[PDB]
Each structure stands twice: as C-alpha cells, then as structure tokens.
Amino acid sequence: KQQSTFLFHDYETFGTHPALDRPAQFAAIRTDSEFNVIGEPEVFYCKPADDYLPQPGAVLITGITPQEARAKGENEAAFAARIHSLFTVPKTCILGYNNVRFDDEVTRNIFYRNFYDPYAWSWQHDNSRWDLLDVMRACYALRPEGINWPENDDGLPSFRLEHLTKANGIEHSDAMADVYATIAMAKLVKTRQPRLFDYLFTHRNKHKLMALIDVPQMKPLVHVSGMFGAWRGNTSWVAPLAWHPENRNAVIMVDLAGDISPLLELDSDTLRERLYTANAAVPVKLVHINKCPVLAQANTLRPEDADRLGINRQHCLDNLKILRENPQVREKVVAIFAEPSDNVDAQLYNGFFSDADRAAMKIVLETEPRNLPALDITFVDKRIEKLLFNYRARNFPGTLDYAEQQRWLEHRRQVFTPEFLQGYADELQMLVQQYADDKEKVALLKALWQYADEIV
C-alpha cells in the first residue's frame, strides 16, 4: 500500500526567532526506511514581505541575502503550501537535526500565518516526527563506543553537525549539505549502535514513552536532554511527580542529581520565582511527551556509565528515597505550573482553534486571493482577522484597497521606527569592522545595507 518513509529537512532562516524572524530557504529529501534516497532533492526559497529586515548574524551564517530570497522565492503562502504537501504524505517520519526545538517551531508558525493547521501534519496519516540531535546526545551518553566524539573549544562534547561529520570522516559542504549530513548521522548510529537506534526510534511514540511514566511510584528514569548540559553528557536520572495542570502533554519531573531542599522547604510562589529567572536552583523540569524526549528505565545507565559522565548515582538514589517519603511535593510542583504581546505573529500558543474556526480557515485557504475581500465568513478567535489582514497584505498586496494600503503603510511605519533603523545601521557598521578581513562577509553586510535602504 503506502511505504514508510523519512523526510529529512532543514530550514535556513533570517533569524533566531521561529515566529518573529522569517524563513529564507527549505531543503528536504525523502528516504526509505533504510535511509536510501527516494526521489529528488526539494530546495526552495521564501520571499520575505516588505515589513521585515533580517538579522545580520543570520545572513552571515547562511550566506542567503534578502535580495536572493526575494528574487528566487515564492511568497510565504506558496512556500507553506509546498512544505505542507511534503509533510502530509502518509506514513512519513518528518525529521531533522534540532528540528524539535527549532525547525518544527518554524513550520508551526509558517502554517499558523498561512491558514494551515499547525499540528495535524505530524500525526495524521500515520505520520510522526524525530530529531537526530538527541539521538546523538543519547549515543554519547549511553553507548559511545564506535563513534568519535568531538570537543568544542571550551573542552566539552560538541553535537554540532559540522563537528560530528568532520570527527567521523563524513563529507560535509550546497543547499542540501545539512540534510545529507543528517542522513549520515542516522546511518552512523544505526550501524554502530543498532539496538539503541531501534530503541530510540520506537520510543519517538508518545504511548511508548507514557508506558515508562509511573507517577504514583515516582519511578526513576534516565533522561538525556540538552537542558542538562554537555558537562554531564546531557544526562541525569529523573522522577515524575505530577502531570502539568494545563498542558496535557507535559509531565513534571525532578532532576534527582539536584538539590531537593527547596522543594521540601519553600512554598510554590517562591519556587515559581526562582524557576523563571534561572539560592539553590529548583531541580524541576517539564518533559514534553510529543517532543521525542529521550527516556529509558533507570538501569539503562549503569554505574560505570554514571562514573564516566560524572553523575553521582547514590545521591540520585538518596534523593529518590526522600521524595517518595514526601508526597506533598507533588501538589507543590503542580501549583508552580498552575500559575503581553499584541503582535499576532507572536500568538501561536494563545490557544487551539475550534473545529468551527479550523473549518472557516480551510475555506480561506481554498478561496482565490482576489475573492477573499468578498468572502462572507465569520471567526470566533480574535487572532484570525489579524492573521487574515497580514496574510493578504504580505502575500497578495495587489488585492488591498486604498484603506487597507494605508493600514499596511502604518504597520510598516511602526516596524521601521527611526530607533530601529538606527540600531540596524549601527549593527551593520559594527559587523563590517569586526569582519573587515572576511571579504565575503563584508559583501553580505553591504547587501543588507542596500536592502534596508530600499525597504526602509
């Protein structure tokens, strides 16, 4: 019938914020279940709308100027359509390298802005997602033998894709370079740690993860997470205390390697304050069951593994005993999580849309742009009419009437304040001095100046 496939992908963007910065380029290729390429590379650009200037640092990294994306790209509506078409092919595992924390948020935001369901793509038609970054971290932590693990310039293990490829003799340039490097990482771990690879892949599924969670017993688990830090191989033992009171997919864990005294001694208001500035640190963290967290039974990390990572196993066991004897900590941590921006681009997580609103937004999607002004349609959620105006003005500006044109002009004036444009110019001048010896970067910075001069 339909074959299971992987769709490896990567974005280049114009900045670090997945909602407020705009995408520049999307790259993807599909493989079979054994990581052999199927079909052709998909690479395309996104034209940025005229209400945005790129972050100069992002352009220095990607080498993609706003002029290039504008001249070679389609509008974000069309960009979104192409990506949505790829991501909704049945039985696809959509994956990348740091996609769970970055690329997937870019995707959610692109879909949100352009009237696609931000979530359905990842689970409908037997689809799933995965991320090779925490696979590499898990391999280093749990089963490192066979792979060369590079250090960064601070002397800690690095999981930068370019460091891992070089360290392991993998060729890594080409818009497809990061995608091909990600495929190489997948092959590396599958070949060299086959049982761990299979375990991690199987446990991408929320139900397999949920089966590991035993809140009444505070059953300990090994967890590998970038939040723990490279200095301990991104690893600790954790115990589940309670599920999040609002977020259906988040469990509240305690880091057993931490100091649990604040949890025993302080009240939830105090605990909440410390947790959100980031004097002992509050050893609580959320694990999101749909974000392919790395979790395994506690004995997966053996004493000799803990020793290698510098983790104090007996301290963790001691803390687990104390927590089990203090079940009032559960209500405390729940109370912590029981508990600003007027830019609709920043409002993806203000709430889920109702079925009625989703049905209305589908009509918007399936209507010709020229016919949108006459569309007799109503929305409940207050984000949607704002999303719709921006959608039309950014993508289909020739369909705006005089009044709408004036509204868009005002929008642009509020973005391009004299203080914003001055700071932008100042940043460019600073970077040209910093990179004066790198003539290609100097050329990129000059391109950014020229674009700002035009778009203003």
Question: Residue numbers of the site for ligand BBP (CB under 6 A)?
Answer: 220, 237, 256, 298-299, 302-303, 313, 316-317, 320
CB 11 within 8 A of CB 90: no
The answer to whether 12 is a known ligand-binding residue is yes
Q: How far apart are CA 416 and CA 407, in angstroms?
A: 14
CB 412 within 8 A of CB 51: yes
Q: How far is the CB of 443 from Mg ion (least distance, A)?
A: 23
Q: How far apart are CA 80 and CA 107, in angstroms?
A: 8
CA quadruple 203, 208, 213, 214: dihedral sign: negative
Q: Which is nearer to ligand BBP, 57 or 303 (CB)?
A: 303
The answer to whether 178 is a known ligand-binding residue is yes
Q: How far is the CB of 223 from ligand BBP (least distance, A)?
A: 11
Q: How far is the CB of 239 from ligand BBP (least distance, A)?
A: 7
Q: Which is nearer to Mg ion, 161 or 301 (CB)?
A: 161
Q: Which is nearer to ligand BBP, 314 or 371 (CB)?
A: 314
10 touches which of Mg ion, ligand BBP, none (CB within 5 to 8 A by kind)? Mg ion
Q: How far is the CB of 136 from Mg ion (least distance, A)?
A: 14
316 touches which of ligand BBP, Mg ion, none (CB within 5 to 8 A by kind)? ligand BBP
Q: How far is the CB of 222 from ligand BBP (least distance, A)?
A: 8
Q: How far is the CB of 305 from ligand BBP (least distance, A)?
A: 9
Question: Site residues (CB under 5 A) for Mg ion?
Answer: 10
Q: Which is nearer to ligand BBP, 70 or 219 (CB)?
A: 219
257 touches which of ligand BBP, Mg ion, none (CB within 5 to 8 A by kind)? none
Q: How far is the CB of 139 from ligand BBP (least distance, A)?
A: 19
373 touches which of Mg ion, ligand BBP, none (CB within 5 to 8 A by kind)? none
133 touches which of Mg ion, ligand BBP, none (CB within 5 to 8 A by kind)? none
298 touches which of ligand BBP, Mg ion, none (CB within 5 to 8 A by kind)? ligand BBP
β-pairing verdict for 250-255 and 284-288: antiparallel
Token readout for 117 is 């369901």
- The alpha carbon of 75 is separated from its chain's Cα centroid by a whole number of angstroms, namely 22
237 touches which of ligand BBP, Mg ion, none (CB within 5 to 8 A by kind)? ligand BBP
Q: Which is nearer to ligand BBP, 270 or 297 (CB)?
A: 297
Q: Which is nearer to ligand BBP, 65 or 319 (CB)?
A: 319
Q: Which is nearer to Mg ion, 10 or 305 (CB)?
A: 10
What angle, rounded to 10 degrees, do the helices at 76-87 and 104-113 form?
120
Residues annotated within a binding site for Mg(2+): 10, 12, 178
Residues annotated within a binding site for substrate: 12, 160
